[model samples]
Target: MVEPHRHEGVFICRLVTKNLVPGESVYGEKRVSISKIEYRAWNPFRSKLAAAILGGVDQIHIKPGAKVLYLGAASGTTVSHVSDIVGPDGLVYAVEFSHRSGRDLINLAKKRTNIIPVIEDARHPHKYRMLIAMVDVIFADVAQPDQTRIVALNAHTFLRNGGHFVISIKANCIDSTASAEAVFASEVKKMQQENMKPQEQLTLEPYERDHAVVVGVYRP
Candidate 1:
C-alpha cells in the first residue's frame, strides 16, 4: 500500500479509503492518518477547493492552527475537511443560511469542537459578524450571483490585512446566458473592484465543468 502524502492536513490517498465517521462519507473519502491521529481525506471531486488544490494553484493559505471563516458550508462536507486541516488548535466558523443544512452542520460541530456552526446569511456579514474573529483565510462557496459582494462583506469584517481568500465560482450561478469565460472575467473583475487582489484562478474540471476557484489577498 502506498502511504498518503500529508499536505496542510489534507491527504493524497488512494480514493477508496473508508470514511472516518462510519455513517458519514464526505466525497467518499476515507479517514487518513499522519501518525496516531486520524485525518479526513479531502476529496477533490467533491470539494471545489480540493479541486483547485489538485489543479496545483500557487497556495492554499490554510495551515495548522490557522483560523478560517467558511461561507456556504452546506451540509458540512468540505467544512469537515477544513476542520481537520486546521486541527484542534484552530477554529472553523462555518456559516450556512439554510435551516435544514444548519441543523446537520450543528450536529457535526458538536462532535468536532473546533467547528463553530452559525446558521446565518453570509450576504449580510454584520448580522453574524460577532461570531467570527480575524481569520487567516476565508473560503467561500456560496455560489450566489453576487457572491463577490458577499465575500467582500465578510472579508472586510473578519479578515485581517493581507489575509487570503479562496472562492469557488459557478458560472451558471452567476449568469447562465454568458459564456463561461465571460462569467469568470466578470467575477475576477468584481474581485478587483473590491480591492481584493486575485493571485490565480483555476478551473475545477472533471469534478465540475464551468466552475472556477479564485485565490486572492484582502489588500484592505
Candidate 2:
C-alpha cells in the first residue's frame, strides 16, 4: 500500500496515506489499493503538511505510533491522513475552536478511533489540557499572529521534552506589511524564546503563497 519513502507511513510523489479507515474516503480524496490494503492520496494543495513534505522538509517527526497534537484541525481534512500516518497504535488530538468545523471533526473522530476531537480555542491549551496526554509532536496551522505563542503554550502544557513540532505560518496572517521571509524569520525567533529549537524552514510555493512551514524541537 506504500512505497519506501524517506518518511515512514507515507508514499512517494502522488503521496498517499495508509487509510486508517479502509473503504472510506475523507474529503473526497482519491484512493488506491495494493495487496488488499488501501491508501488515500494526500493532496498538497489541500494540506499544509502535505505541502511541506512535497516542499522537501528534512524531518516530519510524525511517524507510525507517534502521538500528535494537531492544532487548527479544521474539519480534519489533514487530520484524517495524520490519523492514517500514526496508524492504530498512535493518537491524534485534533483541536479546533469553531464549533461549525468541530462538528465535522467530531464526526471524523467517531469513525477513526485514533482521532480525539477537541472543540475549543487552541490559544488556551489548559482548557482541554486534561483531555490530552504528553505527546511526541505538535502540528499547528492556527494562522494567528500569536501562533508561535499558542504552540509554545500547548507545548508547555502537553508536549514532552525534546518533542517536535511542525508549524505552518501564513505570512499575511502574521503581518502582511513585511516580506514573507521576514515574517517567517520573526516567527522562528519567537519559537526560540519559548524553547522550540527550529531545525528547518520551507516555503509552500505554488501550493500556497506567503506561507512557510517550520520544523523544530521542544528543548524543554
Candidate 3:
C-alpha cells in the first residue's frame, strides 16, 4: 500500500520521506505514522529542496544507494532529510562553513550513520577532499556571491564525470542590484562555461522569493 513518488525515495501527501531515524523529528517537521511505519513531513517553506520538488523540478538525482555531497548544510535540516532519502545504503557528505551550524551538523551525523559531517569551507574543497569520495550528486545551497564557483570547485574535485548538481540560488544573495531572472540567467551561463550543462531551472514561488533551483550535469 506504500508507494514512492516519481522522484524516487520521496513520498506524496506533502512530500514525506521514510525516516532513517524514526520517532525523532528533525527541525520540528510533522511526522506521520501509518501502521508501524513513520514518515517525516518535508516542508516546502522550510526547505528549498521541498519547494523544488513541489515546483515540479525534472530531476533531483539524489536517490537510494546514491552518494551525495551537500554544500552549505547549515544545521543539517535538509541534510537530515537527505540522509533519510539515501537510507542505509547511501552516504551524504555534509559540509558547512559556520562552526555554529557545523556543531549541529556534527550532532546530526552522529545519529545518522549515512551522514558524514565536514566542517570546512566550500570555497577550498581541497581542505576536506580526503574526507569525501566521488559522489553521484552535488547539492549546493551556499547562497554566497561566488555560489557557482564554489559548486564548480567541489564538482571538479568530488563529482564523478556526468554527475549531477542541484543548486539553490538566491538572487539577493548573489546580487541585489540585478533582477532575479537576470541573476538566474547569468548563473546558468556560468554553469555552461564550467561544463555544467543546465538541464532545468525552477523558481521557488510561494515558498521563497528571488530563489531558483538549477539542475545540471558535469561533463569533464
Candidate 4:
C-alpha cells in the first residue's frame, strides 16, 4: 500500500477501493489503506464522475476546505466519494430533485457532516440560495434535456469567479436521435454560451454508453 498523502490535510487519493465512511457500505465499494488513513472505492461503472476520472479528465478542482455545489447528487453515492476528497474541512452542498433519492441522500449526509443535503431542483438555485455560499466548484450530472441551463443557473449564483466545473452529459438525454459526438458538441456549445470555458472532455466507455464528462472553468 502506498503512503497516505494529504494536501492541506485533505486526502489526495480518490477512486480507491476503500470506503470513505467506515462501516457504511453504500455502493458496495472496496477498501484500501496506507498508514492510518483509508479510502473507499468509487465504482466507475456506477458513477459517471468516477468514470470521468478513469477516462482521465483534467482536474477535480476540489481541495481541502474547498466548497462544492453538487447538482444531481442522487442517493449520495458519488457525492460521498466527493465528500472524502474534500475531507472534513471542505463542504459539499448536495442538491437533488428526486424524492426517493433525496431520502437516501439525507440519510447519507447524517453520517458525513461536510455534505449538506438539499432536496431541491437544480433549475432553481434561488430556492436554496441561503443554504449555499459562493463555491469553488460545481459538479453536475442531472442528465436532463435542459441540463446546460441547470448548470448555468446554479453556477451563476453559487460558483465564484475562476471556479471550475465537472459536467456529465448523457447523449440519449440530450437527443436520442443524434450521434454521441453531435450531442457532445451541442452540449459543449451551450455550456460555452453559459460562460463555461471548456477544458477537457472524456468519454466514459465500457462503463457507460454515449456518455461524456466535460471539465471546464466557470467564471459567471
lDDT of all predictions, in order shown?
A: 0.80, 0.91, 0.92, 0.81
Look at candidate 3 and tell me the lDDT of residue 219: 87
Pull out the clashing pairs in model 1.
18-30
Q: What is the C-alpha RMSD of each candidate to the true structure, in Å?
A: 2.9, 1.3, 1.3, 2.7
133-206: candidate 4 lDDT, tens digit per residue? 89999998888999988988998898999999988899999999999999999989887667899898889979
Cα misplacement distance, residue 60 of candidate 4 (Å): 1.7
lDDT of 2 by residue, 81-180 (tens): 8999999999999999999999999999989999999999998887897899999999999989999999999999999998999999999999989999
Which pairs in model 3 have colliding backbones? none
Query: In angstroms, how far off is 24's CA in candidate 4?
Result: 3.2
How well does candidate 1 score on lDDT at residue 44? 73
Q: Which stretches of candidate 2 lie over 4 Å from their true place?
A: none
Worst ten in a row by lDDT for model 4: 3-12
Error of 2 at 97 (Å): 0.5
Sequence-dependent TM-score of model 3: 0.96
- Candidate 1: segments with Cα more than 4 A from true spot: 1-6, 14-29, 32-35
